[PDB]
Write a protein that binds this ligand. Sequence first.
Ligand code: NAG
Ligand code: NAG
Ligand code: NAG
Lengths: 103, 441, 441
Amino acid sequence: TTVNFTVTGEGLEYTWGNHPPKRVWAQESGEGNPHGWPHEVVVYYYNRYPLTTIIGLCTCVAIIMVSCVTSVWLLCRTRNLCITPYKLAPNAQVPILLALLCC
Amino acid sequence: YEHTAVMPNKVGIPYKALVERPGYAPVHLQIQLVNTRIIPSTNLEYITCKYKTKVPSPVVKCCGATQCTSKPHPDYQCQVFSGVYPFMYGGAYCFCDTENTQMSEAYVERSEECSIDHAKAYKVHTGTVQAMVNITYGSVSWRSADVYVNGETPAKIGDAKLIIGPLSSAWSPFDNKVVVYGHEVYNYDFPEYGTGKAGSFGDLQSRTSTSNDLYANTNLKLQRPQAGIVHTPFTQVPSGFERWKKDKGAPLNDVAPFGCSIALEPLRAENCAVGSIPISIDIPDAAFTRISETPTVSDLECKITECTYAFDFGGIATVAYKSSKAGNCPIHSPSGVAVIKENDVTLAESGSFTFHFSTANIHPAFKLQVCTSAVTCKGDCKPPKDHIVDYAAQHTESFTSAISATAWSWIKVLVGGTSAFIVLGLIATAVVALVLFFHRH
Amino acid sequence: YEHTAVMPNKVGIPYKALVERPGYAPVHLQIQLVNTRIIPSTNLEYITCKYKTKVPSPVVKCCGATQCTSKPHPDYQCQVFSGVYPFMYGGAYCFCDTENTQMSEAYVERSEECSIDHAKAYKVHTGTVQAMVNITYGSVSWRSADVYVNGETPAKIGDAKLIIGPLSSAWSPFDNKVVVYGHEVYNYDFPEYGTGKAGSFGDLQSRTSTSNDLYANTNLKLQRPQAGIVHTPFTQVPSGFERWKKDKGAPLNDVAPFGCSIALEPLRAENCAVGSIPISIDIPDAAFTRISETPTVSDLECKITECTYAFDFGGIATVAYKSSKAGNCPIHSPSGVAVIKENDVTLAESGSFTFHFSTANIHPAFKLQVCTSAVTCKGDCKPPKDHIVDYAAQHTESFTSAISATAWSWIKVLVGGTSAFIVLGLIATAVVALVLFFHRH
Ligand SMILES: *[C@@H]1O[C@H](CO)[C@@H](O)[C@H](O)[C@H]1NC(C)=O
Ligand SMILES: *[C@@H]1O[C@H](CO)[C@@H](O)[C@H](O)[C@H]1NC(C)=O
Ligand SMILES: *[C@@H]1O[C@H](CO)[C@@H](O)[C@H](O)[C@H]1NC(C)=O
């Protein structure tokens, strides 16, 4: 029969009947390229730290979404607050610079 | 000079440090544990073994009747079977056809095997912790002695006085109750003496293998002898010790965490890699040489020529140097980034030397101390080729050890851009708020 | 028939109960503890005793010099004193005036008294609890046996099987470390082996009274021999064991709470009156008689003729009764208010019998279970005259035992009066609210 045992950096000991126990340790030889492109970096760290990599990527995406939404919300609110004073005043100078900084 | 530090509770992995006595050149110190033994205190509760059923000759009373009496024998059984007409080789034993009684007797004894084939039930309490420590320092060869890991009892090892602190973890693989059979130890909540059930582990219990008071709890029941036959038939629950020996399960030797190795003389758990061990060693004053009497090393430049973050000493580095008074000079890396294989090197007036190291960092950056001087080594390390190895890791892996320079760059870009987005939005909001204020005023 | 109950952990005070088996007359049961022993598990750490300074003959090298060597003798001291000119009965020992040398040696060994007069340092762990129980039931005379207070191990006491639950309190007077000297036990936190200080308890430590490895820590300093005298003078710190003998203080035997008595073979604490002890006793089936076969009592009238709530059986009561078959009848009081002295009485067709009881209540009220029946006894008890007595109280005092009828009357008057006055105020407020309502409507 064929039996597969998971070995980590902590090590694993197996004893085959009447033989002295043998100890083996797994090295950090996971597949990937930590110096390559983002997909190769993610592959390397996923193979080395599956759960940690999943949590990290999900946290980064959540942070990016929350930050981009907040940034866009603040910028759009800024545009509304900056331009509203002039919408209620059709006969206004409306300097060209206003259309460049607040838009 | 007393050197105090904390070393990990690892066996076969040497602890290296430099004893720096003000005014004297550093003395290299290396402390390695040969074995660590947790020796608990045990009290023998009772001994269990396979029972033997002793059956004395039945009393065949012809033309009459007899009565059974109680006796101080374990699980003693006595019953009078009336109406027997036994036959022997010489014919009918009794004259009367039915007025005859056979009194059968039986009791339980320890079998002959009980002297050798028996299980000892022990109560286990916190005991003591001992270790065999291998120490070398300076030019003194390796010396070792048995020491007590309690932080109090000092040990004299090669003129050096060693005090090994208590283990930071009080963990022990033995429960309050263990069963020792042969060379194997089992964590088994054995029944209290006098409570063992028939056909179970404790069916037969004896305070010691040579005691004269035996507890036996088996359904020993005398059956009626077959018609015309002089014999003492009986039924009994099969030995619960034999049953146990079938269903023992996995011994503690095969399930103890942290790789503990269980020994019986005395009962102990060896090489348990739990916690860390504080240490204090008083190095003899004669082992130190004044600073002005040792070589001065300068112009150090460290180049990593090859590196792989394997568990072995996969790293190789070359250090160029200039010095004077050519002679031996210790080498040490105080940080955990890299473990140096060599303990000392021979330095000429000028040249270079090489050393090997083991590191878990993909971009190791560690300080190397060359006696009175130090240099910073930096480089890149390749992944190891072997998936599985038969030796423990020499280095220690840190949280940031695996993060490459590229990963750091991406993290920096992520955080910087995200923060800049929020910062820019807030600045724009503040600017427009001020403009509106100036509009009103 | 198994009877289970909880009895107080008191020595010399019997526990009385009626074993009520459905369909059979009650069987009186009396369980009394003769002694209770807490026997902890101990590990001998080392033996301390007064040291002896062994001083081998000095080596007087005339016209030359010698060098001391290191030896494993405990606290070994060796010093070379140059310029000695010793004289003996024969005159000048050496020729040369200043070129001769005396080597002095001294080492510490256990004194002869250490065989008998020594202190044993023990580490104490939770062990076992044992007791001697005296039991009588029905017409069976008093029987006793030594039992283990485990709650599982049964003991056969006169055909009855007794199981005693573990003590409700795990309290033990012994600390984690104790020192046994002579007949006394001290809760002394002795220093670990190898760390004893000169002039203190642990100055000399030995793993056993016969161990060949003796630890000795005394400031043994060899002094220069006096001019012209061949001798090996030395200074040493007085033994710390003798100093401890002077300052050892009060032993555990004299300060242990709960009146524990300390014994050494094995080390144990006796008669510690802590908590309560569960009990389970199986009364043999033969001890029970069918109800129809025993006397039936009726028209029971209990009169308290005299009562004093003294520690002894100061109460006397008379019970009038009528009974058929004029047989024997167990007497018991299941309420804790009073403990009955008599276990049973002899009944006639009609008459009265007297019994004695001890109660702490100033107005006792208790149910007296005359076999298969019951009578309520009530009375008034006077205070005892003796201020101090040399015997323990036979009864149990309760929170309300001392509250007299007058005290209850005053408590009821104060509580009721204040409550009624409060209710009067609330009622008046509600009534006036209704009066105002009717004023508007
Ligand atoms: C073990 O792993 C190999 C691939 O490495 C696979 O072919 C085999 O089926 C596995 N066996 C079990 C029992 O999982
Ligand atoms: C101590 O270490 C050295 C070198 O590793 C070795 O020669 C020696 O045998 C070790 N001591 C023991 C007791 O194993
Ligand atoms: C048990 O009690 C009886 C009467 O109280 C007494 O004579 C006997 O000695 C007691 N047994 C023991 C062991 O003290």
